[PDB]
Design an enzyme around this catalytic site. Structure first.
Site, PDB file in Angstrom:
ATOM      1  CB  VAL A  68      -1.026   0.024   1.151  1.00  0.00           C
ATOM      2  CG1 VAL A  68      -2.096  -1.040   0.943  1.00  0.00           C
ATOM      3  CG2 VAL A  68      -0.333  -0.140   2.496  1.00  0.00           C
ATOM      4  N   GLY A  69       2.161   1.142  -0.094  1.00  0.00           N
ATOM      5  CA  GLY A  69       2.963   2.344  -0.230  1.00  0.00           C
ATOM      6  C   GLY A  69       4.401   2.169   0.219  1.00  0.00           C
TER       7      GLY A  69
ATOM      8  CB  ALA B   4      12.901   8.064   2.300  1.00  0.00           C
TER       9      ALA B   4
ATOM     10  N   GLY C 197      10.628   3.280   4.916  1.00  0.00           N
ATOM     11  CA  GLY C 197      10.156   1.907   4.912  1.00  0.00           C
ATOM     12  C   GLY C 197       9.139   1.664   3.816  1.00  0.00           C
ATOM     13  CB  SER C 198       8.016  -1.094   1.948  1.00  0.00           C
ATOM     14  OG  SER C 198       9.229  -0.747   1.301  1.00  0.00           O
ATOM     15  CB  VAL C 199       3.193   0.457   4.461  1.00  0.00           C
ATOM     16  CG1 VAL C 199       2.004   0.081   5.357  1.00  0.00           C
ATOM     17  CG2 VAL C 199       4.089   1.450   5.166  1.00  0.00           C
TER      18      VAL C 199
ATOM     19  CE  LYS D  28       7.116   2.534   9.871  1.00  0.00           C
ATOM     20  NZ  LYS D  28       6.819   3.924  10.339  1.00  0.00           N
TER      21      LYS D  28
ATOM     22  CG  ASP E 152       2.738   9.572   9.697  1.00  0.00           C
ATOM     23  OD1 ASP E 152       2.812   8.397  10.118  1.00  0.00           O
ATOM     24  OD2 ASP E 152       2.601   9.857   8.484  1.00  0.00           O
TER      25      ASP E 152
HETATM   26 MG   LIG Z   1       2.164  11.505   7.155  1.00  0.00          MG
END
Ligand SMILES: [Mg+2]
Ligand SMILES: CCCc1ccc(NC(C)=O)cc1O
Ligand SMILES: [Cl-]
Ligand SMILES: [Cl-]
Ligand SMILES: [Cl-]
Ligand SMILES: [Cl-]
Length: 347
Positions: A26-27, A30, A32-34, A49, A164
């Site tokens: 889903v995305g 810089a 990580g990846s999720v 993540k 975040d």
């Molecule tokens: Mg954000």
């Protein structure tokens, strides 16, 4: 220790406990990846993540520790919490990868603001929840640093969570006509002051104004254009505040500008609840010492329908002494490993 299984998704290896099924990317950022997944132990849809290069340098290793410490501490209805953290490694010697698990979030406040017709009751409830979560965050002596609509998750019942946290954004990321800068307090936009919790209240004021009007409050095309938009609304600094301004770079530039009075907010926010106008005047103040705090704002009459002083909790104490500590990469890595293995899941 659970059994782990491996798979390759979009050129990345994912090695995760069997409990997590149906992984779907889903995305990527810089850091990580999720992937979205179904957690068979709890029945929740989750975000998983995988951190990228978590220990590549001293700076990066310390940032990984900082993020895990913050997420393990946050236990509040209006703040994102940690559901799980894991590594496939069986010992510190083979430890390299860190995975973080949270509730999967759908819409953010950007989606709500651009598409929906918001009543005054909606604005009351949404800003109330931001301030309830911020009272908790600030009571632990944590500063969010990056409050903006894309960092606020909202569900179909109008329930909100803060996401975040700022982990300490590049200069290129804050350049030009960019939402990454539109919510930042004027005293930190050019680093004229050190960060403190009052910067988060400025951000809340910008968000609330945008919910009331449907439009960005200070959409500057660069740092200087944005400062001019700010000073036109709130006025140039008075004698009292100028006396307190320590930065010589700030004083020199500020004194080059023609003086301007604070504008009438009832003529800017036409048709808004007078109580909303009053609260905005108490948030959007240049002198950060004089801004309303989150705890004070919860008691403002604008929130009379929702305020309950017996249901606005504070946080357990949070030890941030590590932030001034100088350690080697492997020492930050060992501290992170200890925090992974000591995690206890929520009830
Ligand atoms: Mg954000
Ligand atoms: C255009 C002025 C920017 C600025 C600079 C410094 C401060 N200092 C405090 C203590 O609040 C506040 C400011 O708003
Ligand atoms: Cl499992
Ligand atoms: Cl590993
Ligand atoms: Cl945003
Ligand atoms: Cl602590």
């Amino acid at each position: 220790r659970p059994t782990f299984y491996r798979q390759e998704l979009n050129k990345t290896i994912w090695e995760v406990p069997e409990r997590y099924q149906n992984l779907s990317p889903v995305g990527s950022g810089a850091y990580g990846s999720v992937c979205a997944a179904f957690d068979t132990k709890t029945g929740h849809r989750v975000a998983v993540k995988k951190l990228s290069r978590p220990f590549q340098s001293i700076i990066h290793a310390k940032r990984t520790y900082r993020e895990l410490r913050l997420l393990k501490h946050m236990k509040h209805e209006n703040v994102i919490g940690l559901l799980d953290v894991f590594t496939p490694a069986r010992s510190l010697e083979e430890f390299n990868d860190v995975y973080l698990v949270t509730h999967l979030m759908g819409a953010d406040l950007n989606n709500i603001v651009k598409c929906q017709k918001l009543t005054d009751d909606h604005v009351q409830f949404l800003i109330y929840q931001i301030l309830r979560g911020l009272k908790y965050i600030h009571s632990a002596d944590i500063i969010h640093r990056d409050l903006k609509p894309s960092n606020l998750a909202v569900n179909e019942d109008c329930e909100l969570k803060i996401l975040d946290f700022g982990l300490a954004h590049t200069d290129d990321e804050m350049t030009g006509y960019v939402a990454t800068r539109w919510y930042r307090a004027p005293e930190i936009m050019l680093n004229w002051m050190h960060y403190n919790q009052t910067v988060d209240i400025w951000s809340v004021g910008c968000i609330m104004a945008e919910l009331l009007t449907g439009r960005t409050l200070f959409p500057g095309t660069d740092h200087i254009d944005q400062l001019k938009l700010i000073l036109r609304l709130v006025g140039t600094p008075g004698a009292e505040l100028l006396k307190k301004i320590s930065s010589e770079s700030a004083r020199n530039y500020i004194q080059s500008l023609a003086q301007m009075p604070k504008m009438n907010f009832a003529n800017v926010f036409i048709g808004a609840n007078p109580l909303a106008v009053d609260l905005l005047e108490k948030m959007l103040v240049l002198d950060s010492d004089k801004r309303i705090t989150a705890a004070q704002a919860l008691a403002h009459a604008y929130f009379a329908q929702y305020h309950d002083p017996d249901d606005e909790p504070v946080a357990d104490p949070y030890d941030q002494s590590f932030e001034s500590r100088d350690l080697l990469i492997d020492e930050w890595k060992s501290l992170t490993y200890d925090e992974v293995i000591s995690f206890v899941p929520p009830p």
